[PDB]
């Protein structure tokens, strides 16, 4: 994940890895 473009679901993977069970948002 480090020093990578995060396109599509890759961003969702990254947000889960950072926010865990707190949830996260990325749209709209």
């Amino acid at each position, epitope marked *: *994940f*480090v020093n990578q*473009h995060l*396109c*599509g*679901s890759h961003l*969702v993977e990254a947000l*889960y890895l950072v926010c*865990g069970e707190r949830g996260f948002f*990325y749209t709209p």
Partner: antibody
Amino acid sequence: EVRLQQSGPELVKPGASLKISCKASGYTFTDYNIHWLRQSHSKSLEWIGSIYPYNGRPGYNQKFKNKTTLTVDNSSSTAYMELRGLTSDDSAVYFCARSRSYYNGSRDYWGQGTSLTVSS
Amino acid sequence: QIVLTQSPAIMSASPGEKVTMTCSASSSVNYMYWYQQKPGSSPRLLIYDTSNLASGVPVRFSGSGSGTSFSLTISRMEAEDAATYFCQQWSSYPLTFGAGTNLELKR
């Protein structure tokens, strides 16, 4: 060539524990999540969880959290899933997998699966 | 939590026919995956992020959809496409799959 190699078929008794391994090669192990999935039959796929091999930080499906523990051994490029309190309901094939490569990947990678039979 | 419902659970086609399989989500999904699986084989990725063609899969396949309704299409069925097809949302966690759509051959 990316490959994920899983441990062999397993048969255990109810209540026992089991650690299934997933061996990775062909890429920087530390850069990608390893995902774990269970296939109870030909019409069911479930995501168990994911682990970040850089530091071992895992994310669990709450349904499997109580009885599943994910670890990693970066020096051996291997991921492990531990199952506890096993019952016949846990009989299934278990898959590890890795997402498509970042930026412009078009191919993900799956292990061959490990068959688990929970019976006395 | 996001429940995916694939219909028809069972459908038949002969080579040359157009096949459309649907995946209905219980809530908004931003990225939908699609996998193919035959007995004795690992799930094979076909579509990533809703409409992108996975590597090594033929151009007769196509993914589409938005919000709560998604589709996988085979412009012209070939016999070797007999298999079960799964949708998987990669929008919110936990990741969930549909129960699959069995595509069998007509006779």
